[PDB]
Scaffold this active site. Structure first.
Site, mmCIF file in Angstrom:
data_model
loop_
_atom_site.group_PDB
_atom_site.id
_atom_site.type_symbol
_atom_site.label_atom_id
_atom_site.label_comp_id
_atom_site.label_asym_id
_atom_site.label_seq_id
_atom_site.Cartn_x
_atom_site.Cartn_y
_atom_site.Cartn_z
ATOM 1 C CG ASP A 1 -1.811 1.162 1.366
ATOM 2 O OD1 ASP A 1 -2.222 1.500 2.517
ATOM 3 O OD2 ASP A 1 -2.162 1.830 0.372
ATOM 4 C CG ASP B 1 -3.857 4.672 -2.297
ATOM 5 O OD1 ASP B 1 -3.327 3.600 -1.933
ATOM 6 O OD2 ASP B 1 -4.845 5.097 -1.659
HETATM 7 C C1 LIG Z 1 -9.563 1.392 0.124
HETATM 8 C C2 LIG Z 1 -8.603 1.757 1.223
HETATM 9 O O1 LIG Z 1 -9.038 2.226 2.263
HETATM 10 N N1 LIG Z 1 -7.306 1.515 0.984
HETATM 11 C C3 LIG Z 1 -6.233 1.692 1.956
HETATM 12 C C4 LIG Z 1 -5.535 0.341 2.139
HETATM 13 C C5 LIG Z 1 -6.558 -0.752 2.414
HETATM 14 C C6 LIG Z 1 -6.651 -1.891 1.615
HETATM 15 C C7 LIG Z 1 -7.607 -2.878 1.897
HETATM 16 F F1 LIG Z 1 -7.690 -3.968 1.112
HETATM 17 C C8 LIG Z 1 -8.480 -2.745 2.977
HETATM 18 C C9 LIG Z 1 -8.391 -1.605 3.772
HETATM 19 F F2 LIG Z 1 -9.208 -1.425 4.830
HETATM 20 C C10 LIG Z 1 -7.435 -0.625 3.486
HETATM 21 C C11 LIG Z 1 -5.250 2.806 1.573
HETATM 22 O O2 LIG Z 1 -4.324 3.099 2.624
HETATM 23 C C12 LIG Z 1 -6.039 4.058 1.238
HETATM 24 N N2 LIG Z 1 -5.246 5.270 1.152
HETATM 25 C C13 LIG Z 1 -5.859 6.571 1.333
HETATM 26 C C14 LIG Z 1 -6.257 6.797 2.800
HETATM 27 C C15 LIG Z 1 -7.576 7.055 3.208
HETATM 28 C C16 LIG Z 1 -7.899 7.269 4.549
HETATM 29 C C17 LIG Z 1 -6.911 7.251 5.520
HETATM 30 C C18 LIG Z 1 -5.580 6.994 5.150
HETATM 31 C C19 LIG Z 1 -4.469 6.966 6.179
HETATM 32 C C20 LIG Z 1 -4.956 7.515 7.523
HETATM 33 C C21 LIG Z 1 -3.312 7.823 5.706
HETATM 34 C C22 LIG Z 1 -3.938 5.553 6.391
HETATM 35 C C23 LIG Z 1 -5.279 6.773 3.791
HETATM 36 C C24 LIG Z 1 -4.846 7.630 0.895
HETATM 37 C C25 LIG Z 1 -5.299 9.082 1.057
HETATM 38 C C26 LIG Z 1 -6.671 9.215 0.486
HETATM 39 N N3 LIG Z 1 -7.372 10.324 0.158
HETATM 40 N N4 LIG Z 1 -8.590 9.814 -0.335
HETATM 41 C C27 LIG Z 1 -8.686 8.477 -0.319
HETATM 42 C C28 LIG Z 1 -7.497 8.031 0.194
HETATM 43 C C29 LIG Z 1 -7.063 6.610 0.405
#
Ligand SMILES: CC(=O)N[C@@H](Cc1cc(F)cc(F)c1)[C@H](O)CN[C@@]1(c2cccc(C(C)(C)C)c2)CCc2[nH]ncc2C1
EC number: 3.4.23.46
Length: 380
Positions: free
Chosen positions: A35, A227
């Site tokens: 990730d 991402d």
């Molecule tokens: C779909 C999703 O949540 N993917 C994440 C990885 C993941 C994979 C999976 F198979 C299950 C799961 F629960 C999580 C990944 O870290 C998402 N990354 C962002 C992000 C959003 C909420 C908070 C975070 C931090 C606080 C930083 C961890 C990250 C990156 C920033 C951003 N802005 N808009 C949307 C995003 C997505």
């Protein structure tokens, strides 16, 4: 070497790509989701209905408790756990071992996916977005600091249809360099605007060669990032609406339920009759390191129409966002992406596992002369 790292990623469509890792002494094997959208290394460390196995700290002689709690909320899922350190290795990675921070996941909610085959997550982004605070050194920072592995990695995420040898889609995470057999043509580089998420700047968007015609600040409203942990291409409200408007217009010959365009309902066609020609290519122009060396990455409908099942079914993999542009897995698929952290830039090239199309071809093309970070960057 790098050859030892080719094809080290596996995954199920829409459920991330994972790599094999070991934790503790003796080594306990776990599959870990790669990730670039987070910076915490965390593993299941307690029984869960969807976990095939988990990290048992009591059986590791090298485990050290940090006596600190931690929680990370993602887009929908979240977990809580206990911080500690332990020896970490990547069997199909560099021949090294490192002491890294590990969030031992004790409870979770909508994080683990039924039958996914991964038990943890490897946040590859910077300390700035690490929980509970930026003092918690991310795994990649630890790897680089403790070994001689160069400060850079690359991801080749492949779509469906390619030979593998639990199933559907594979890829490569080359740690410490670039493998030339994984791409064709030239690598084009765009600056990492800031070291927190892998933030970049989009300077132009075209649909079937026609400029969307928006203030380019709108494309990076809040931010624009790369991402691998997010499936879809996520676009800010205004860009999403203008984009779906052009895509609907291009594909007007056929009509789909409103549910389809919201990413909730699937669309099907008699096997092998998917009418790809009526869905347009989306061109995302990324700011060049020098602005007369900007470039575009061209995305075909084979990428933004994610295949699923129950003859040929598809989900619209472009979603609305109120949190900026997220270039997820569907975008990265068919491109080789170099996270050149040492030179604060991200490289794009056409992947060896690029999407087919009988009359169109994904591309990374330049040079282009475009607007600046100052004209296009949103200041928060
Ligand atoms: C779909 C999703 O949540 N993917 C994440 C990885 C993941 C994979 C999976 F198979 C299950 C799961 F629960 C999580 C990944 O870290 C998402 N990354 C962002 C992000 C959003 C909420 C908070 C975070 C931090 C606080 C930083 C961890 C990250 C990156 C920033 C951003 N802005 N808009 C949307 C995003 C997505």
């Amino acid at each position: 070497s790098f050859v030892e790292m080719v094809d080290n990623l596996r995954g199920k469509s829409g459920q991330g790509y994972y790599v094999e890792m070991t934790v503790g002494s003796p080594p306990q094997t776990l599959n870990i989701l790669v990730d670039t959208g987070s910076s915490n290394f965390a593993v299941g460390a307690a029984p869960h209905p969807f976990l095939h196995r988990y990290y048992q700290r009591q059986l590791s002689s090298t485990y050290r408790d940090l006596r600190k709690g931690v929680y990370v909320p993602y887009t929908q899922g979240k977990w809580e756990g206990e911080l500690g350190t332990d020896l970490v290795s990547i069997p199909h990675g560099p021949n090294v071992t490192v002491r890294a921070n590990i969030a031992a996941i004790t409870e979770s909610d909508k994080f683990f996916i039924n039958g996914s085959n991964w038990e943890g997550i490897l946040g590859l982004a910077y300390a700035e977005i690490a929980r509970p605070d930026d003092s918690l050194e991310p795994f990649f920072d630890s790897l680089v600091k403790q070994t001689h592995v160069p400060n850079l990695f690359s991801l080749q995420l492949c779509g469906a249809g390619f030979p593998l040898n639990l199933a559907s889609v594979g890829g490569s995470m080359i740690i410490g360099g670039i493998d030339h057999s994984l791409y064709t043509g030239s690598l084009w580089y765009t600056p990492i605007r800031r070291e927190w998420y892998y933030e970049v700047i989009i300077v132009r968007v075209e649909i079937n060669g026609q400029d969307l015609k928006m203030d380019c600040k709108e494309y990076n409203y809040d931010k624009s990032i790369v991402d691998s942990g997010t499936t879809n291409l996520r676009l800010p409200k205004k860009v999403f609406e203008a984009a779906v408007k052009s895509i609907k217009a291009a594909s007007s010959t056929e009509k789909f339920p409103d549910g389809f365009w919201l990413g909730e309902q699937l669309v099907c066609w008699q096997a092998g009759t998917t009418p790809w020609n009526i869905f347009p290519v989306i061109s995302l122009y990324l700011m060049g390191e020098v602005t007369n060396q900007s470039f575009r990455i061209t995305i075909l409908p084979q990428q933004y129409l994610r295949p699923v099942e129950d003859d040929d079914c598809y989900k619209f993999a472009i979603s609305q966002s109120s949190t900026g542009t997220v270039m997820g897995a569907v975008i990265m698929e068919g491109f080789y992406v170099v996270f050149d952290r040492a030179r604060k830039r991200i490289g794009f090239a056409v992947s060896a596992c690029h999407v087919h199309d009988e009359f169109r071809t994904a591309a990374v093309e330049g040079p282009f002369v475009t607007l600046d970070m100052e004209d296009c960057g949103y200041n928060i």
